[PDB]
């Protein structure tokens, strides 16, 4: 559960990400596939090589979902209802994988935001990604 | 189980890691990001705000020891479990730290290396470090296994 | 995040517990202290012996809090905010302990309500206890 | 470790376990309560609802094998790692099951025992069984350690 300060921090940090959101989504996926190779079992069709168009494309979709979650932070079950159906009901993703991707998104933000990735921002983003992850791993409709 | 190329990458980056500060940064961020961990550090004094934590001299001094332990693991990658035996007994048998918190601190450290090294902290360099921090956490949790 | 069926299941199962709530709360605490002795670190000055009046009284408090959470399943951050203050801000309980208590509560219910503890009801109660645990471990005010 | 009196209380209750039911009920509840686990068992056919899971004959048959592995553990409490070595390779090296899921299945089994035994599944008896299922989960996870 997010505090007012967390919501401010998330909106400010994601604002700093701005137009790079898609790039960062893609890099986070790449980091995840290299660090935690079992996650690749969810994307076997995909070309998972460095510079992959498929990873670039997927990364943009992930990023846009996160932007949507930020804009609807007080309405996440509703905003992410179709993504929850996909991840929790259809794909049955093991929740551990959300911890892995969330970590890799934090690493990616840390690597790109050396002037803005403060401890408080880190904290708020970690909570935000836990909240998103909880919605996407829940079947509630 | 790091490739030779992964070993040189890990070694090269680590030689640039500031021993006085990176550990304190990782411990400090652990205390801020995962607030329940503060319960283990009542003797450290003021942890009331992020600024209090990150400026806290006991967090910095303790973090230097944590970082020294990671340095030890890096020098003994083929025997992390032996390297960490004494610390495993402290953390598991005496303090009863939940082992997930070992993984959390390892991941915080990776976030700290990323912050510091930026473009140098490439996905393949991360992957090598992830094997290291997984091995350290596993070794620290040995006494639960 | 709970589905409508989860909410129905939880209200029905906890409604069946009824007047047993405190007894079953105390039994769950006892199960937890015996099964997972590290949890006794949170209660260092308590009498945790079998039959303990302090465990009985604490069990009633936990049980009443759950009753409140069940009633206010769609308003839990508000309803449980003082308990979040207590568990997240003051005691700083490590979240793993919530898994352990939650487990012991499910064991207790299984042992006492064989007809009501169906797989679906077990699943819904696990999710409900996770939601309660998330509120109590979060700092959001 | 289990004391002699714990081991005695465990074996007395286990002797009364319905060997055709308890395993499939534990596996079925795992799949219902923790639905992501169904990804490992898709080949078992219809798992689309709680009743479908619990009425699935492959779940029942597989559950009987799982129960048998628990029986084997109970007969080898001083050597669980050796008893489960090949099973560990299957579950870790081949299936890549996250080890938390081993703990979840052990705890679901404890719930099923409570369900069957009611008041006879006393808090001390539960504590003994928790050591057992922790040991089995740890032994299954040995190939990750
Ligand atoms: C922050 C967490 C996550 C977000 C925001 C997210 C978002 C998305 C989005 C937006 C889609 C595309 C939906 C569409 O095209 O309609 C998607 C698809 C998918 N996601 Fe995720 N996801 C997350 C975590 C995960 C994780 C941890 C995994 C597995 C490791 C995963 C596996 C997949 C798969 C397999 C697909 C379908 C891919 C395809 O068919 O192209 N996701 N996700
Ligand atoms: C995962 C990597 C970790 C490493 C490498 C590490 C390393 C160390 C080291 C080197 C010491 C000092 C030992 C000595 O001076 O004899 C120590 C002590 C300690 N560690 Fe850790 N530790 C880790 C994780 C954690 C976590 C996650 C917690 C708690 C949430 C924790 C809590 C402590 C405590 C309470 C002490 C004793 C502090 C004191 O009384 O001065 N450690 N650790
Ligand atoms: C479903 C989860 C939980 C609920 C509903 C809950 C509820 C409560 C309530 C209502 C109180 C106030 C007692 C009073 O006013 O006398 C309380 C206090 C407390 N809780 Fe929890 N609790 C939960 C989980 C936990 C867990 C997992 C731990 C630690 C293992 C814990 C440790 C404590 C402690 C140490 C106190 C203060 C006891 C005292 O010193 O008097 N709680 N809890
Ligand atoms: C923790 C205790 C567990 C025990 C004692 C156990 C035991 C077994 C046994 C005895 C087998 C049959 C091996 C054979 O036929 O040679 C097996 C197979 C299997 N187990 Fe487990 N297991 C455990 C946990 C899990 C968990 C948590 C998962 C998944 C979430 C899992 C997934 C599987 C799968 C997919 C198979 C192959 C089944 C098939 O398709 O026939 N197991 N396990
Ligand atoms: O933080 C958010 C939106 S993002 C998010 N993460 N977890 C939840 C959440 C809402 N209700 C739940 C029930 C049980 C478990 C978690 C949840 O929400 N909402 C939010 C924050 C503060 C309050 C308040 O101070 O009353 C109310 C609402
Ligand atoms: O299930 C509940 C109450 S109990 C609970 N557990 N987690 C949450 C929760 C609410 N908002 C969150 C934000 C992020 C993470 C988790 C949460 O709530 N509410 C709930 C259920 C379904 C819907 C819907 O279909 O739109 C909306 C709301």
From Swiss-Prot, chains A, C:
A GO cellular component entry from the record? endocytic vesicle lumen
Residues with the modification Phosphothreonine, per the entry, are: 8, 108, 134, 137
Sites of N6-succinyllysine modification: 7, 11, 16, 40
Modified-residue entries (Phosphotyrosine), positions? 24
**Recorded consequence of changing residue 78 to K:** In Stanleyville-2
Outcome when changing residue 139 to E: In Hanamaki; O(2) affinity up
The organism's superkingdom is given as Eukaryota
Determine if Heme is one of this entry's keywords: yes
Q: Tissue range of expression?
A: Red blood cells.
Result, substituting residue 103 to R:
In Contaldo; unstable
Q: What happens when you mutate residue 131 to P?
A: In Questembert; highly unstable; causes alpha-thalassemia
Modification N6-acetyllysine, positions: 16
According to the record, mutating residue 87 to N results in: In Auckland; unstable
Effect caused by changing residue 22 to D: In J-Medellin
Tell me the outcome of changing residue 31 to S. Answer: In Prato; unstable
Q: What is the effect of changing residue 136 to P?
A: In Bibba; unstable; causes alpha-thalassemia
Impact when changing residue 16 to M: In Harbin; slightly unstable
What happens when you mutate residue 125 to P? In Quong Sze; causes alpha-thalassemia
Does this UniProt record's set of keywords contain Transmembrane? no
Q: What is the effect of changing residue 26 to E?
A: In Shenyang; unstable
Q: Can you tell me which residues are glycosylated?
A: 7, 16, 40, 61
According to the record, mutating residue 95 to T results in:
In Godavari; O(2) affinity up
Q: Per the UniProt entry, what is one GO biological process? A: inflammatory response
Quote the protein name from its UniProt record.
Hemoglobin subunit alpha
Naturally occurring in which organism (per UniProt): Homo sapiens
Curated annotation (Swiss-Prot), chains B, D:
Question: Outcome of residue 65 to I?
Answer: In Vigo; O(2) affinity down
Q: According to the UniProt record, what happens if one changes residue 89 to K?
A: In Agenogi; O(2) affinity down
CDD domains in UniProt: Hb-beta-like
Mutating residue 22 to G has which effect?
In Miyashiro; O(2) affinity up; unstable
The entry's stated outcome for residue 28 to D is: In Lufkin; unstable
- Tell me the impact of changing residue 92 to R: In Okazaki; O(2) affinity up; unstable
Q: Which InterPro entries match?
A: Globin (IPR000971), Globin-like_sf (IPR009050), Globin/Proto (IPR012292), Hemoglobin_b (IPR002337), Hemoglobin_oxygen_transport (IPR050056)
Annotated site location: Not glycated: 58, 81, 94
Instruction: Report the outcome of residue 116 to P.
Output: In Saitama; unstable
The annotated consequence of residue 91 to D reads: In J-Altgelds Gardens; unstable
Q: What is the effect of changing residue 74 to R?
A: In Pasadena; O(2) affinity up; unstable
Reported effect, residue 24 to R: In G-Taiwan Ami
Q: Describe what happens upon changing residue 135 to D.
A: In Hope; O(2) affinity down; unstable
Query: Know the name of this protein?
Result: Hemoglobin subunit beta
From what organism does this protein derive? Homo sapiens (Human)
The beginning of the lineage is: Eukaryota, Metazoa, Chordata, Craniata, Vertebrata
